[PDB]
Amino acid sequence: SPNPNNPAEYCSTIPPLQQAQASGALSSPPPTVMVPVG
Amino acid sequence: SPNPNNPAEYCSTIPPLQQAQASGALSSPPPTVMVPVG
Amino acid sequence: DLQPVTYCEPAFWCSISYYELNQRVGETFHASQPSMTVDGFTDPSNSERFCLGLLSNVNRNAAVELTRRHIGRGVRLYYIGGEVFAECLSDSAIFVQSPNCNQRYGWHPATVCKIPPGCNLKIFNNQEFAALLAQSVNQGFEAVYQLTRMCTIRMSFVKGWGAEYRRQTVTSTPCWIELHLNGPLQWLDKVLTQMGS
Amino acid sequence: DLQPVTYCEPAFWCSISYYELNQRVGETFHASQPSMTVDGFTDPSNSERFCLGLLSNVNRNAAVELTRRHIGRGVRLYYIGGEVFAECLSDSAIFVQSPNCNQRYGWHPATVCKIPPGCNLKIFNNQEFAALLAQSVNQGFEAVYQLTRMCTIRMSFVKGWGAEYRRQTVTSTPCWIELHLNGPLQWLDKVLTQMGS
């Protein structure tokens, strides 16, 4: 885990778009969760 | 409001009991709140 | 028994409310597009840009207006694959209180981090969200209703708040906003529904 | 239309759970008396004293046991007029995360304060609680169900946690406990009931 006081440990200068690519977030269809109906 | 970093600004060396007195917490009957039934 | 509930991307993925200290200011801005900004420009907002330069607050004081001058380009917001980034375009850092972020990173609950200029941050990981949602489902209603808190993110321009801070609450910050991730919220509703049949 | 809901002092005003890091340890201790303590003495607990010296944790590591040595006299807890104090009897400070405290004092939400030795702190103001409860009622269910969080207080002996901290979560602290103010919770239930008729 990164220190919340050091953005450098958790932020990025990489364009957001360019990031969502190399992680397959676009090609990724919406997620699903099974929920017991009760 | 007191600084959360200075107990001195919010704690006490006065016995708890001795405190609840000079504030009428014992003589104080339980509180009530009116709640709209809906 | 176990019926699948899928996340569904909303038309308007989030709504934004602006605040000057404890006073809400302006109307609620609704995000329809993938990439927009919330700035302080004196231009009329639109589908892609939520300007604040034109917002009046009769009780605005010197401190608020002075800070309002530094929002500037503000923050660029992006929604993609249910992922949400916030890029500080402004020349003044921005601060974020995202429950989702605090969840990963293992930070203390309620923490507010700084997104300095030129930087961005994935304020919402929809997957990580699904994982919790998934796990939560198996702990009943309350457990799940708890994730609603995660669909609300607050951010303040220029000045930050939190513990270790001078300003302890968001309500004591000059210029802030609150977003609501509709995607997650809808999905959270649907879920409770299926649990509440 | 408006039916009065009164606070009623429970038989057992709170229950205490002990933890070593993320592992819950021992059984749930129930407070029946007005003034008791939670210490680390190796004596058999009773109505008036929740000793921890005798609690075993097969996964206990050196750090936990070492700290467990410093609880000592621990903390004396008092309930009176629905008011709840915590007196650090121990020679090592104790840390408290009380939503009620953070409410007044205007501290950031989730903060953890230090109650050094020889000092005490009213961790719960039942009145201040009623005031919120009162106000809340007039904001619907959710608003009220929110105060449930206030009936849960966490405390760790010797070592503290929180933002500005090395240990970010209560779960990363050597020796802690969680209490549940039944008085408030019952009263909170009753209220929702009357709202849920």
Side-chain angles (χ1 to χ4, degrees), chain B residues 3-31:
Chain B
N3 183 318
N5 281 98
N6 314 319
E9 293 176 0
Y10 58 74
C11 293
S12 171
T13 60
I14 286 297
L17 20 208
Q18 307 275 173
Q19 303 173 65
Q21 299 301 180
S23 65
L26 296 301
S27 49
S28 97

PDB file of all heavy atoms in Angstrom, chain B residues 3-31:
ATOM      1  N   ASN B   3      -8.112  20.673  19.181  1.00  0.00           N
ATOM      2  CA  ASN B   3      -7.265  19.939  18.259  1.00  0.00           C
ATOM      3  C   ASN B   3      -7.269  18.501  18.722  1.00  0.00           C
ATOM      4  O   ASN B   3      -7.016  18.225  19.890  1.00  0.00           O
ATOM      5  CB  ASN B   3      -5.823  20.461  18.283  1.00  0.00           C
ATOM      6  CG  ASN B   3      -4.923  19.745  17.274  1.00  0.00           C
ATOM      7  OD1 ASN B   3      -4.992  18.529  17.112  1.00  0.00           O
ATOM      8  ND2 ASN B   3      -4.068  20.502  16.604  1.00  0.00           N
ATOM      9  N   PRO B   4      -7.570  17.563  17.811  1.00  0.00           N
ATOM     10  CA  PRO B   4      -7.600  16.138  18.143  1.00  0.00           C
ATOM     11  C   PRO B   4      -6.222  15.612  18.535  1.00  0.00           C
ATOM     12  O   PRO B   4      -6.097  14.501  19.057  1.00  0.00           O
ATOM     13  CB  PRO B   4      -8.118  15.498  16.861  1.00  0.00           C
ATOM     14  CG  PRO B   4      -7.621  16.433  15.798  1.00  0.00           C
ATOM     15  CD  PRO B   4      -7.937  17.775  16.402  1.00  0.00           C
ATOM     16  N   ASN B   5      -5.191  16.414  18.284  1.00  0.00           N
ATOM     17  CA  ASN B   5      -3.827  16.028  18.608  1.00  0.00           C
ATOM     18  C   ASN B   5      -3.411  16.454  20.001  1.00  0.00           C
ATOM     19  O   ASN B   5      -2.309  16.120  20.436  1.00  0.00           O
ATOM     20  CB  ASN B   5      -2.832  16.619  17.602  1.00  0.00           C
ATOM     21  CG  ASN B   5      -2.775  15.841  16.305  1.00  0.00           C
ATOM     22  OD1 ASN B   5      -3.404  16.216  15.320  1.00  0.00           O
ATOM     23  ND2 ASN B   5      -2.018  14.742  16.303  1.00  0.00           N
ATOM     24  N   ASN B   6      -4.272  17.199  20.693  1.00  0.00           N
ATOM     25  CA  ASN B   6      -3.954  17.655  22.052  1.00  0.00           C
ATOM     26  C   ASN B   6      -5.026  17.192  23.009  1.00  0.00           C
ATOM     27  O   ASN B   6      -6.038  17.869  23.217  1.00  0.00           O
ATOM     28  CB  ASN B   6      -3.820  19.176  22.114  1.00  0.00           C
ATOM     29  CG  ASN B   6      -2.990  19.711  20.986  1.00  0.00           C
ATOM     30  OD1 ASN B   6      -1.967  19.122  20.632  1.00  0.00           O
ATOM     31  ND2 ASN B   6      -3.416  20.831  20.404  1.00  0.00           N
ATOM     32  N   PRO B   7      -4.812  16.022  23.615  1.00  0.00           N
ATOM     33  CA  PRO B   7      -5.778  15.479  24.552  1.00  0.00           C
ATOM     34  C   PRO B   7      -6.164  16.548  25.554  1.00  0.00           C
ATOM     35  O   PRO B   7      -7.324  16.701  25.924  1.00  0.00           O
ATOM     36  CB  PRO B   7      -5.008  14.327  25.188  1.00  0.00           C
ATOM     37  CG  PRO B   7      -4.145  13.866  24.067  1.00  0.00           C
ATOM     38  CD  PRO B   7      -3.618  15.166  23.547  1.00  0.00           C
ATOM     39  N   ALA B   8      -5.160  17.304  25.969  1.00  0.00           N
ATOM     40  CA  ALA B   8      -5.318  18.378  26.947  1.00  0.00           C
ATOM     41  C   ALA B   8      -6.458  19.322  26.609  1.00  0.00           C
ATOM     42  O   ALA B   8      -7.036  19.973  27.481  1.00  0.00           O
ATOM     43  CB  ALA B   8      -4.037  19.140  27.015  1.00  0.00           C
ATOM     44  N   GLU B   9      -6.768  19.398  25.324  1.00  0.00           N
ATOM     45  CA  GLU B   9      -7.826  20.259  24.860  1.00  0.00           C
ATOM     46  C   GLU B   9      -9.168  19.545  24.871  1.00  0.00           C
ATOM     47  O   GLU B   9     -10.184  20.153  24.548  1.00  0.00           O
ATOM     48  CB  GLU B   9      -7.513  20.762  23.445  1.00  0.00           C
ATOM     49  CG  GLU B   9      -6.317  21.698  23.357  1.00  0.00           C
ATOM     50  CD  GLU B   9      -6.010  22.086  21.931  1.00  0.00           C
ATOM     51  OE1 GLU B   9      -6.740  21.620  21.035  1.00  0.00           O
ATOM     52  OE2 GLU B   9      -5.042  22.846  21.704  1.00  0.00           O
ATOM     53  N   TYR B  10      -9.186  18.270  25.244  1.00  0.00           N
ATOM     54  CA  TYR B  10     -10.448  17.536  25.267  1.00  0.00           C
ATOM     55  C   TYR B  10     -10.612  16.454  26.335  1.00  0.00           C
ATOM     56  O   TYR B  10     -11.702  15.920  26.514  1.00  0.00           O
ATOM     57  CB  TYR B  10     -10.740  16.945  23.872  1.00  0.00           C
ATOM     58  CG  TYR B  10      -9.694  16.000  23.307  1.00  0.00           C
ATOM     59  CD1 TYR B  10      -9.562  14.696  23.800  1.00  0.00           C
ATOM     60  CD2 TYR B  10      -8.836  16.406  22.275  1.00  0.00           C
ATOM     61  CE1 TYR B  10      -8.604  13.815  23.290  1.00  0.00           C
ATOM     62  CE2 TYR B  10      -7.874  15.537  21.756  1.00  0.00           C
ATOM     63  CZ  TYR B  10      -7.765  14.239  22.272  1.00  0.00           C
ATOM     64  OH  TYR B  10      -6.812  13.360  21.785  1.00  0.00           O
ATOM     65  N   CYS B  11      -9.544  16.135  27.050  1.00  0.00           N
ATOM     66  CA  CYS B  11      -9.625  15.112  28.080  1.00  0.00           C
ATOM     67  C   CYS B  11      -9.764  15.736  29.442  1.00  0.00           C
ATOM     68  O   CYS B  11      -9.913  16.949  29.572  1.00  0.00           O
ATOM     69  CB  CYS B  11      -8.385  14.225  28.066  1.00  0.00           C
ATOM     70  SG  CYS B  11      -8.253  13.227  26.590  1.00  0.00           S
ATOM     71  N   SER B  12      -9.691  14.899  30.465  1.00  0.00           N
ATOM     72  CA  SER B  12      -9.834  15.386  31.816  1.00  0.00           C
ATOM     73  C   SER B  12      -9.257  14.457  32.866  1.00  0.00           C
ATOM     74  O   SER B  12      -9.246  13.241  32.695  1.00  0.00           O
ATOM     75  CB  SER B  12     -11.307  15.620  32.117  1.00  0.00           C
ATOM     76  OG  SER B  12     -11.478  15.900  33.493  1.00  0.00           O
ATOM     77  N   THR B  13      -8.782  15.062  33.954  1.00  0.00           N
ATOM     78  CA  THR B  13      -8.210  14.341  35.082  1.00  0.00           C
ATOM     79  C   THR B  13      -9.250  14.381  36.215  1.00  0.00           C
ATOM     80  O   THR B  13      -9.029  13.871  37.316  1.00  0.00           O
ATOM     81  CB  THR B  13      -6.857  14.975  35.535  1.00  0.00           C
ATOM     82  OG1 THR B  13      -7.060  16.337  35.926  1.00  0.00           O
ATOM     83  CG2 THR B  13      -5.847  14.949  34.388  1.00  0.00           C
ATOM     84  N   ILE B  14     -10.398  14.994  35.924  1.00  0.00           N
ATOM     85  CA  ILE B  14     -11.500  15.073  36.879  1.00  0.00           C
ATOM     86  C   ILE B  14     -12.207  13.733  36.852  1.00  0.00           C
ATOM     87  O   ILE B  14     -12.575  13.256  35.785  1.00  0.00           O
ATOM     88  CB  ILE B  14     -12.546  16.147  36.476  1.00  0.00           C
ATOM     89  CG1 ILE B  14     -11.988  17.535  36.736  1.00  0.00           C
ATOM     90  CG2 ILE B  14     -13.837  15.974  37.281  1.00  0.00           C
ATOM     91  CD1 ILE B  14     -11.703  17.826  38.200  1.00  0.00           C
ATOM     92  N   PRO B  15     -12.403  13.107  38.017  1.00  0.00           N
ATOM     93  CA  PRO B  15     -13.088  11.811  38.063  1.00  0.00           C
ATOM     94  C   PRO B  15     -14.378  11.912  37.246  1.00  0.00           C
ATOM     95  O   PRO B  15     -15.127  12.878  37.379  1.00  0.00           O
ATOM     96  CB  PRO B  15     -13.362  11.622  39.550  1.00  0.00           C
ATOM     97  CG  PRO B  15     -12.232  12.359  40.203  1.00  0.00           C
ATOM     98  CD  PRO B  15     -12.130  13.616  39.371  1.00  0.00           C
ATOM     99  N   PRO B  16     -14.649  10.917  36.390  1.00  0.00           N
ATOM    100  CA  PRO B  16     -15.844  10.889  35.538  1.00  0.00           C
ATOM    101  C   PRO B  16     -17.115  11.128  36.318  1.00  0.00           C
ATOM    102  O   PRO B  16     -17.990  11.892  35.912  1.00  0.00           O
ATOM    103  CB  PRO B  16     -15.794   9.498  34.927  1.00  0.00           C
ATOM    104  CG  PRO B  16     -14.319   9.253  34.819  1.00  0.00           C
ATOM    105  CD  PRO B  16     -13.832   9.713  36.171  1.00  0.00           C
ATOM    106  N   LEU B  17     -17.203  10.448  37.448  1.00  0.00           N
ATOM    107  CA  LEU B  17     -18.332  10.556  38.354  1.00  0.00           C
ATOM    108  C   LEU B  17     -18.509  12.033  38.750  1.00  0.00           C
ATOM    109  O   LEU B  17     -19.566  12.636  38.527  1.00  0.00           O
ATOM    110  CB  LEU B  17     -18.078   9.640  39.570  1.00  0.00           C
ATOM    111  CG  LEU B  17     -16.660   9.141  39.966  1.00  0.00           C
ATOM    112  CD1 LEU B  17     -16.835   7.802  40.671  1.00  0.00           C
ATOM    113  CD2 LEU B  17     -15.715   8.921  38.773  1.00  0.00           C
ATOM    114  N   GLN B  18     -17.448  12.619  39.296  1.00  0.00           N
ATOM    115  CA  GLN B  18     -17.447  14.018  39.713  1.00  0.00           C
ATOM    116  C   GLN B  18     -17.889  14.945  38.586  1.00  0.00           C
ATOM    117  O   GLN B  18     -18.387  16.036  38.845  1.00  0.00           O
ATOM    118  CB  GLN B  18     -16.046  14.420  40.176  1.00  0.00           C
ATOM    119  CG  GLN B  18     -15.456  13.505  41.245  1.00  0.00           C
ATOM    120  CD  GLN B  18     -15.885  13.874  42.652  1.00  0.00           C
ATOM    121  OE1 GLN B  18     -15.591  13.156  43.615  1.00  0.00           O
ATOM    122  NE2 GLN B  18     -16.574  15.007  42.783  1.00  0.00           N
ATOM    123  N   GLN B  19     -17.700  14.517  37.340  1.00  0.00           N
ATOM    124  CA  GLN B  19     -18.090  15.329  36.183  1.00  0.00           C
ATOM    125  C   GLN B  19     -19.586  15.213  35.923  1.00  0.00           C
ATOM    126  O   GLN B  19     -20.283  16.219  35.787  1.00  0.00           O
ATOM    127  CB  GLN B  19     -17.341  14.882  34.922  1.00  0.00           C
ATOM    128  CG  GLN B  19     -15.838  14.920  35.013  1.00  0.00           C
ATOM    129  CD  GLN B  19     -15.178  14.306  33.791  1.00  0.00           C
ATOM    130  OE1 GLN B  19     -15.306  14.814  32.682  1.00  0.00           O
ATOM    131  NE2 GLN B  19     -14.473  13.198  33.991  1.00  0.00           N
ATOM    132  N   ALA B  20     -20.072  13.978  35.848  1.00  0.00           N
ATOM    133  CA  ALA B  20     -21.486  13.714  35.589  1.00  0.00           C
ATOM    134  C   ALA B  20     -22.407  14.414  36.592  1.00  0.00           C
ATOM    135  O   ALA B  20     -23.616  14.551  36.362  1.00  0.00           O
ATOM    136  CB  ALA B  20     -21.737  12.217  35.601  1.00  0.00           C
ATOM    137  N   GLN B  21     -21.831  14.845  37.713  1.00  0.00           N
ATOM    138  CA  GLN B  21     -22.594  15.542  38.740  1.00  0.00           C
ATOM    139  C   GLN B  21     -22.840  16.961  38.272  1.00  0.00           C
ATOM    140  O   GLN B  21     -23.962  17.338  37.944  1.00  0.00           O
ATOM    141  CB  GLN B  21     -21.815  15.585  40.056  1.00  0.00           C
ATOM    142  CG  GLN B  21     -21.501  14.230  40.650  1.00  0.00           C
ATOM    143  CD  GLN B  21     -22.748  13.417  40.950  1.00  0.00           C
ATOM    144  OE1 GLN B  21     -22.662  12.288  41.431  1.00  0.00           O
ATOM    145  NE2 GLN B  21     -23.914  13.987  40.663  1.00  0.00           N
ATOM    146  N   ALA B  22     -21.765  17.739  38.240  1.00  0.00           N
ATOM    147  CA  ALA B  22     -21.821  19.132  37.826  1.00  0.00           C
ATOM    148  C   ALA B  22     -22.260  19.293  36.371  1.00  0.00           C
ATOM    149  O   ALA B  22     -21.690  20.087  35.624  1.00  0.00           O
ATOM    150  CB  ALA B  22     -20.458  19.792  38.044  1.00  0.00           C
ATOM    151  N   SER B  23     -23.272  18.535  35.972  1.00  0.00           N
ATOM    152  CA  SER B  23     -23.796  18.619  34.619  1.00  0.00           C
ATOM    153  C   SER B  23     -25.191  18.023  34.649  1.00  0.00           C
ATOM    154  O   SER B  23     -25.888  17.984  33.635  1.00  0.00           O
ATOM    155  CB  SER B  23     -22.912  17.841  33.648  1.00  0.00           C
ATOM    156  OG  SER B  23     -22.947  16.459  33.937  1.00  0.00           O
ATOM    157  N   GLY B  24     -25.581  17.559  35.835  1.00  0.00           N
ATOM    158  CA  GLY B  24     -26.891  16.960  36.037  1.00  0.00           C
ATOM    159  C   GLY B  24     -27.207  15.829  35.081  1.00  0.00           C
ATOM    160  O   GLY B  24     -28.229  15.855  34.397  1.00  0.00           O
ATOM    161  N   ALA B  25     -26.335  14.827  35.033  1.00  0.00           N
ATOM    162  CA  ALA B  25     -26.539  13.693  34.140  1.00  0.00           C
ATOM    163  C   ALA B  25     -27.227  12.551  34.872  1.00  0.00           C
ATOM    164  O   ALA B  25     -27.902  11.723  34.257  1.00  0.00           O
ATOM    165  CB  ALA B  25     -25.203  13.228  33.568  1.00  0.00           C
ATOM    166  N   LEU B  26     -27.061  12.518  36.191  1.00  0.00           N
ATOM    167  CA  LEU B  26     -27.673  11.479  37.016  1.00  0.00           C
ATOM    168  C   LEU B  26     -29.115  11.844  37.318  1.00  0.00           C
ATOM    169  O   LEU B  26     -30.027  11.043  37.115  1.00  0.00           O
ATOM    170  CB  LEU B  26     -26.911  11.318  38.328  1.00  0.00           C
ATOM    171  CG  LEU B  26     -25.473  10.830  38.193  1.00  0.00           C
ATOM    172  CD1 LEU B  26     -25.480   9.481  37.486  1.00  0.00           C
ATOM    173  CD2 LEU B  26     -24.640  11.858  37.432  1.00  0.00           C
ATOM    174  N   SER B  27     -29.307  13.062  37.813  1.00  0.00           N
ATOM    175  CA  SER B  27     -30.632  13.571  38.134  1.00  0.00           C
ATOM    176  C   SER B  27     -31.475  13.621  36.865  1.00  0.00           C
ATOM    177  O   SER B  27     -32.707  13.670  36.924  1.00  0.00           O
ATOM    178  CB  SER B  27     -30.512  14.977  38.733  1.00  0.00           C
ATOM    179  OG  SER B  27     -29.680  15.807  37.935  1.00  0.00           O
ATOM    180  N   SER B  28     -30.793  13.589  35.720  1.00  0.00           N
ATOM    181  CA  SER B  28     -31.436  13.660  34.409  1.00  0.00           C
ATOM    182  C   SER B  28     -32.128  12.379  33.961  1.00  0.00           C
ATOM    183  O   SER B  28     -31.489  11.340  33.752  1.00  0.00           O
ATOM    184  CB  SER B  28     -30.418  14.072  33.331  1.00  0.00           C
ATOM    185  OG  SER B  28     -29.893  12.948  32.637  1.00  0.00           O
ATOM    186  N   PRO B  29     -33.457  12.435  33.823  1.00  0.00           N
ATOM    187  CA  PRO B  29     -34.186  11.249  33.385  1.00  0.00           C
ATOM    188  C   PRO B  29     -33.831  10.992  31.913  1.00  0.00           C
ATOM    189  O   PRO B  29     -33.303  11.878  31.231  1.00  0.00           O
ATOM    190  CB  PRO B  29     -35.645  11.651  33.601  1.00  0.00           C
ATOM    191  CG  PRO B  29     -35.619  13.147  33.403  1.00  0.00           C
ATOM    192  CD  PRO B  29     -34.377  13.538  34.147  1.00  0.00           C
ATOM    193  N   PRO B  30     -34.112   9.781  31.405  1.00  0.00           N
ATOM    194  CA  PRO B  30     -33.794   9.466  30.010  1.00  0.00           C
ATOM    195  C   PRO B  30     -34.506  10.379  29.023  1.00  0.00           C
ATOM    196  O   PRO B  30     -35.686  10.679  29.189  1.00  0.00           O
ATOM    197  CB  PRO B  30     -34.241   8.015  29.877  1.00  0.00           C
ATOM    198  CG  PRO B  30     -35.431   7.969  30.758  1.00  0.00           C
ATOM    199  CD  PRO B  30     -34.944   8.715  31.993  1.00  0.00           C
ATOM    200  N   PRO B  31     -33.797  10.817  27.969  1.00  0.00           N
ATOM    201  CA  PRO B  31     -34.332  11.700  26.929  1.00  0.00           C
ATOM    202  C   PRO B  31     -35.374  11.062  26.012  1.00  0.00           C
ATOM    203  O   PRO B  31     -35.500   9.836  25.918  1.00  0.00           O
ATOM    204  CB  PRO B  31     -33.080  12.123  26.168  1.00  0.00           C
ATOM    205  CG  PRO B  31     -32.235  10.896  26.241  1.00  0.00           C
ATOM    206  CD  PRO B  31     -32.384  10.485  27.690  1.00  0.00           C
TER     207      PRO B  31
END
